[PDB]
RNA sequence: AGGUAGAGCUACUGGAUGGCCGAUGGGCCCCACAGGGUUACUGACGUCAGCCAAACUCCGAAUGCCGGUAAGUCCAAGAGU
RNA sequence: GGUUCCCUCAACCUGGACGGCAAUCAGGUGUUGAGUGUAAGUGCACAAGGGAGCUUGACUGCGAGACGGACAUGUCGAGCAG
RNA sequence: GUUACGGCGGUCCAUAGCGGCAGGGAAACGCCCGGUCCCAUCCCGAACCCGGAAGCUAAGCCUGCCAGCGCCGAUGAUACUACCCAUCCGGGUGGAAAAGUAGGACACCGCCGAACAC
């Protein structure tokens, strides 16, 4: 699972979920990609579950790129306690995704398997998404 | 007290004019310094008490 | 469990007291600041804690001199 | 050049066993000194009692 | 070909003097009532000016380039005294009574001090 | 390469802003700007469906011929503003050109051919810069990967260019990278 | 006069994806030491492309606030001090 | 601490007995990435940073005009005389 | 009045900087010669200071041309936003960026002084 080596500040405010993506909205490395259509926090566990779904489908050949990193932490206070007395300890790492952002990428010789492999991964993410190509 | 309070008295009229602090480990001796004395009306040598 | 935070200090009310165009007397405080974000100009002096005060009556004017922000006092003319 | 801090400096004279002589200034108080090898004497520059005993007892 | 590697001594000397002349000017400045006396010293001559910094204009000026100063039979210090007296004549003619000495970024003493002391007894007070 | 310029009708806008541009797009139009060596920009409007037809077939760097209320002008497409989501054309920068003039243009490179079966072809640089005549810009550039073996770098200096076309970008751009096809064990260690 | 919204990063402090070149290292052979390559290898610095931040900023609004000025309301706001 | 005068770092490259990544020497690039007694912030290369000579204003009587403020507190200050 | 000339200053202090090529020594600005005298080195006449004029424009400085690196930078469009419509989408009036593009740019101005001329 993707985890940053270190962060200056361990307890942070929630990332804002307004607006569309400014950068990262085009496919740069591979030939096919997955473009988001909704706001969400993509946890580092849904990325691992979504890039193993691509690996199983294409088997041997091809390359996969992950363009988003789970940097920003979210806290969770101990169970069954009243409100107050501090802020909870961090538990999971998320990535702030806005509509238009391209999440994954793939290079594979044939198209039918490539579009099927990327569909297997949209079903693991908590948002709607679509498959985009390098062409205009 | 490392830095105790000390009082500087004029040599001539012996009036106590000023009070300050000095480190008694760095400066084990009585501080000697020239300061203005209102009674004498001029700058006179002052010494710690 | 508890929190080890919870301290703070009183707000020091810094900022600019007289803005551009205001007519001031002599010795009147213009800017309260920590460093020299603004530098003294003509007829303006710097206090002990980097306060800027007027050295002569006039109207405040902000300028720049070699990339340095300065505060100047211009002598409004008698009727 | 400060006055009372530098070592006392003397015009000297250098003599070598080959007859080559100099005239330089050094810190030697005598004003002269003898050297057993100089620029002209040394084989490395020119390219050319223990060893005297080899030719003495044996020859 | 040829290509110099470092900085000449003249280049180092020039920037170092202007470095320590702008440090001087953070205090002294010229006014119409109290103009600034600026001195430029070289290995051959010495120049003075009387500058009003509000307008950036020169009030009076004297120099050793003049033929009268060249007639002096003394050494360089003798030329400074002549120049120092010629600036008190022209400044007081223009209506100037008090000045401030801008030593130009040179050490005060020798040719600079001889010029100042010659202009002090000649009428200019500073 | 000689390209017959595409004729497009342009109207000079009466009102500009963000309220007038949104209304223009609601009527199947696109705002445009015509600057260049004329040195006085013209604010135009273009048909949305006719502009998209020209870009679809003749590429992004299409040469145009605008009829600005009875005056003929030769123009070149310089830039486009495309919505990330709705995938529109929100704007278009147009540069005036004349025949016999050299312009700097980015054209696309295509990878055709099948290499050794145990290799994966990865294209690093999508486009490269050239310097061609105003009416002689190639629509696309092609490279061939046929029998290319193992790890080779196909560089931007080895692209075959037509006559009158000069490479502008440095000749050390890695355009196409052919490498050994990753195995199943090499897939599971990439991105963990 | 700011430094938020936005945006930007070879403009600083940190996070961080994929290429290219490659000192350092596991080493193997250079018979032992110095002695060059060798390797699905470990890869600093650099460089090409795409990114992120309340306690990042080369930048940077709209409003709000301070002052001047010309009017408006003016048998009233039933104002301000 | 006061004043007067002078100076420019950190990092990297190259050459040097012990000596190496790093001690002291030398040449070059280097505009602030070093440093500022002590946290952080605003500043400081014009230096507020580095070095040296003299010295006690780390004063006496005062203080126009202001900042901030429930009140009591708190803060800045040109200038006059000894 | 002219000048490939010397100083003192400016400008919302790089449109002025870095780098490259080619040129100048009339007076000045410099390197340069020397340490007897005022003065100086935490050692060193290298630097500060003084007394000079054998040599040279090789450097500093000055002049002309280059858009490679830095720097400035529109119009239009977008992000954002005050107020107002809008029953969970969104829109109207006003303001309006950052980035990018066309381009600009190898500074401009003021006061003294020199040599030549009048
Ligand atoms: Zn007394």
Same domain for F31 and F105? no
| Region for residue F70 given its phi and psi (left: phi exceeds 0; alpha: psi -120 to 50; beta: otherwise) | left
Structural contact between residues C37 and C63, judged by C-beta atoms closer than 8 angstroms: no
Residue with tokens 């051959």: E44
Alpha-carbon gap, residue B5 to A112, rounded angstroms: 90
Q: Which of residues 73-92 of A touch C (CB under 8 A)?
A: 78, 85-87
Residues 6+ apart with CB under 8 A from A53: A117, A120, A121, A123, A124
Task: For residue B19, report the distance from its CA to the centre of ligand 1, in Å.
Answer: 15
Residue at E21 is within a domain: no
- Domain containing F146 equals 99-192
Residue at E87 is within a domain: yes
Alpha-carbon gap, residue E125 to E97, rounded angstroms: 7
Alpha-carbon gap, residue D51 to F41, rounded angstroms: 101
- DSSP code for A55: H
Structural contact between residues F154 and F178, judged by C-beta atoms closer than 8 angstroms: yes
Domain stop point among F65, F98, F131: F98
Residue at E64 is within a domain: yes
Structural contact between residues F132 and F105, judged by C-beta atoms closer than 8 angstroms: yes
Domain stop point among F98, F129, F146: F98
Structural contact between residues B24 and B6, judged by C-beta atoms closer than 8 angstroms: no
DSSP per residue, A78-113: PSS--S-SS-PEEEEEEEEE-TT-EEEEEE-S-HHH
Same domain for F74 and F163? no
Binding residues of D for Zn(2+): 16, 18, 38, 41
Identify the helix (H) or strand (E) that includes residue E38: strand E36-41
Alpha-carbon gap, residue A1 to B45, rounded angstroms: 77
Q: Indicate which CATH number applies to the domain containing E89.
A: 3.30.420.100
- List strand I contacts in E 27-86 (CB < 7 A): 38, 40-45, 47, 49, 51, 53, 55-58, 61, 63, 65-66, 75-77
Residues 6+ apart with CB under 8 A from C48: none
Look at residues E56, E63, E121, E59 and name the one whose alpha carbon lies nearest to residue E95: E59
Look at residues F12, F80, F71 and name the one whose alpha carbon lies nearest to residue F46: F12
Residue at E69 is within a domain: yes
Alpha-carbon gap, residue A98 to E22, rounded angstroms: 55
Chain H positions with any atom < 7 A from a protein CB? 5-8, 27-29, 41-44, 46-48, 55-60, 64-69, 75-78, 82
- Please judge whether C2 and A86 are an interchain contact, meaning their C-beta atoms are less than 8 angstroms apart: yes
Residues 6+ apart with CB under 8 A from A63: A30, A106, A107, F120, F122, F182, F190
Residue at E65 is within a domain: yes
Shortest Cα distance, chain C CAs vs residue A76, angstroms: 14
Same domain for F37 and F123? no
Alpha-carbon gap, residue C71 to C42, rounded angstroms: 8
Total domains, chain E: 1
Shortest Cα distance, chain A CAs vs residue C10, angstroms: 23
Phi, psi of A62 (to 5 degrees): 110, 165
Same domain for F6 and F77? yes
Same domain for F179 and F111? yes
Structural contact between residues A78 and A51, judged by C-beta atoms closer than 8 angstroms: no
Residue at E16 is within a domain: no
Same domain for F133 and F69? no
Structural contact between residues F108 and F141, judged by C-beta atoms closer than 8 angstroms: yes
Same domain for F1 and F73? yes
Segments of D1-59 assigned E as strands: 10-11, 14-16, 25-26, 33-35
Alpha-carbon gap, residue A62 to A30, rounded angstroms: 10
Structural contact between residues C30 and C57, judged by C-beta atoms closer than 8 angstroms: no
To the nearest 10 degrees (0 to 180), the angle between helices A111-122 and A44-58 is: 150
Sign of CA dihedral B24, B25, B26, B29: positive
CB atoms closer than 10 angstroms to residue E105 = 19
Same domain for F34 and F87? yes
Experimental method: cryo-EM
Could you give the dihedral angle defined by the CA atoms of residues C16, C22, C23 and C29, in that order, rounded to the nearest 10 degrees?
A: 0
> How far is residue E81 from each of residues E48, E85, E114, E119, E120, measured CA to CA in Å?
12, 6, 6, 8, 11
Structural contact between residues E3 and E92, judged by C-beta atoms closer than 8 angstroms: no
Q: Write down the number of H helices and E strands in chain F.
A: 3, 13
- DSSP code for C44: E
Can you list the alpha helix ranges (DSSP code H) found in B1-49?
Answer: none
CB atoms closer than 10 angstroms to residue B32 = 11
Report CA(D47)–C1'(I78) in Å, whole number. Answer: 85
Same domain for F106 and F21? no
Alpha-carbon gap, residue A75 to A54, rounded angstroms: 30
Same domain for F85 and F107? no
Strand F102-112 and strand F141-144: the pairing is parallel
Residue at E53 is within a domain: yes
> Please, what is the Cα angle at A18 between A64 and A4, to 5 degrees?
45
Structural contact between residues F30 and F66, judged by C-beta atoms closer than 8 angstroms: no
Segments of chain A assigned E as strands: 32-36, 40-43, 63-66, 72-76, 89-97, 102-107, 129-133
Same domain for F92 and F179? no
Based on the number of CB atoms within 10 Å of its own CB, is E33 exposed (0-12), middle (13-18) or buried (19 or more)?
Answer: exposed
Same domain for F59 and F148? no
Domain stop point among F77, F98, F119: F98
Total domains, chain F: 2
Alpha-carbon gap, residue A98 to A15, rounded angstroms: 11
Alpha-carbon gap, residue F166 to F162, rounded angstroms: 9
- Domain containing E51 equals 27-126
Residue at E78 is within a domain: yes
Comparing every residue's Cα with the C1' atom of nucleotide H55, the nearest one is B34
């Amino acid at each position: 699972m993707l985890i940053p080596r270190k962060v200056k500040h361990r307890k942070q405010h929630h990332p804002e979920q307004r607006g569309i993506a400014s950068g990262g909205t085009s496919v740069s490395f591979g030939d096919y990609g997955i473009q988001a259509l909704e706001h969400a926090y993509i946890t580092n566990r849904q990325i691992e579950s979504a890039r193993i779904a691509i690996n199983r489908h294409i088997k041997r050949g091809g390359k996969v790129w992950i363009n988003i990193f789970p940097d920003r932490p979210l806290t969770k206070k101990p169970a069954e306690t009243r409100m107050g007395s501090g802020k909870g300890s961090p538990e999971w790492w998320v990535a702030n995704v806005k509509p238009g952002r391209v999440l994954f990428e793939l290079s594979y010789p044939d198209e039918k398997t490539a579009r099927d492999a990327l569909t297997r991964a949209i079903h693991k993410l908590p948002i709607k998404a679509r498959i985009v190509t390098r062409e205009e | 007290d490392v830095r105790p309070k000390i009082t500087l008295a004029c040599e001539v009229c012996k009036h106590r004019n000023y009070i300050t602090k000095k480190n008694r480990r760095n400066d084990p001796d009585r501080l000697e310094i020239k300061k203005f004395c209102p009674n004498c009306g001029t700058h006179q040598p002052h010494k710690e008490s | 469990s508890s929190s080890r935070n919870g301290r703070d200090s009183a707000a020091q009310r810094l900022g600019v007291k007289r803005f551009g165009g205001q007519v001031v007397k002599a010795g009147e405080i213009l800017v309260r600041q920590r460093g020299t974000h603004f530098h003294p100009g003509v007829n303006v002096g710097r206090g002990g804690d980097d306060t800027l005060f007027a050295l002569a009556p006039g109207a405040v004017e902000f300028g720049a001199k070699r990339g340095r922000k300065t505060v100047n006092i211009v002598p409004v003319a008698r009727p | 050049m400060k006055t009372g801090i530098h070592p006392e400096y003397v015009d000297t004279t250098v003599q070598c066993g080959c007859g080559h002589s100099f005239t330089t200034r050094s810190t030697k108080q005598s004003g002269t000194i003898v050297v057993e090898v100089c620029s002209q004497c040394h084989p490395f520059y020119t390219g050319k009692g223990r060893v005297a005993r080899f030719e003495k007892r044996y020859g | 070909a040829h290509k110099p590697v470092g900085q000449n001594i003249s280049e180092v000397r020039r920037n170092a003097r202007l470095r320590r002349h702008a440090r001087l000017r953070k205090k002294v400045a010229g006014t119409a009532e109290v103009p600034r006396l600026v001195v430029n010293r070289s290995a051959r001559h010495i120049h003075v000016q009387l500058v009003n910094d509000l307008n950036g204009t020169t009030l009076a000026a004297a120099s050793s380039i003049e033929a009268d100063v060249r007639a002096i039979d003394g050494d360089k210090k003798a030329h400074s005294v002549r120049v120092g007296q010629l600036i008190a004549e022209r400044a007081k003619a223009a209506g100037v009574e008090t000045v401030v000495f801008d030593r130009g970024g040179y050490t005060y003493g020798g040719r600079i001090a001889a010029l100042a002391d010659a202009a002090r007894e000649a009428g200019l007070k500073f | 390469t000689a390209n017959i310029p595409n004729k497009l009708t342009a109207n000079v806008r009466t009102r500009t802003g963000k309220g007038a541009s949104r209304q223009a797009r609601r009527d199947g139009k696109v705002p445009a700007v015509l600057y260049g060596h004329g040195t006085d920009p013209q604010h135009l409007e273009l048909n949305a469906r006719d502009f998209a037809a020209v870009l679809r077939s003749h590429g992004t760097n299409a040469i145009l011929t605008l009829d600005i209320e009875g005056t003929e002008q030769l123009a070149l497409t310089k830039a486009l503003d495309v919505h990330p989501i709705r995938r529109n054309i929100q704007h278009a920068d147009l540069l005036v050109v004349q025949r016999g003039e050299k312009v700097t243009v980015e054209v696309t490179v295509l990878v055709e051919g099948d290499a050794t079966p145990g290799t994966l072809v990865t294209q690093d640089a999508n486009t490269i810069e050239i310097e061609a005549e105003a009416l002689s810009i190639p629509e696309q550039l092609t490279v061939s990967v046929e029998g290319v073996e193992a790890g080779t770098q196909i560089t931007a200096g080895q692209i075959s260019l037509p006559e009158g076309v000069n490479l502008i970008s440095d000749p050390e751009l890695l355009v196409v990278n052919v490498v050994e096809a990753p195995s199943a064990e090499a897939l599971e260690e990439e991105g963990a």
